[PDB]
Homo-oligomer: A and B are copies of this chain.
Amino acid sequence: MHPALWVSKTGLDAQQTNIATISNNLANASTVGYKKSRAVFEDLFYQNINQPG
C-alpha cells in the first residue's frame, strides 16, 4: 500500500534473522567445538526515480 510499509517490513525481517542468529549463539554456549555466527547486513536495490548524474 505504501513504500515505507514494505521497506520497514524488510527491516523487521532482517532484525528477526539477526536476533535469531544471536539467540542461537547463546544457546550453544556450552556445545563443545562450536563456532559462533554473525549476520551480515546489506541494503536492497534502489528505485531510480531521477538519475544521480
Contact = CB atoms under 8 A, between A and B. Distances in A.
Given A10-B27, A14-B27, A27-B8, A3 B32 contact: no
Contacts of A32: 40-41
Nearest to A49: B17
Interface in A1-35: 2-4, 7-8, 10-11, 14-20, 22-24, 26-32, 34
A24 B2 contact: no
B4 A28 contact: no
B4 A19 contact: yes
A33 to B, nearest CB: 10
B8 A26 contact: yes
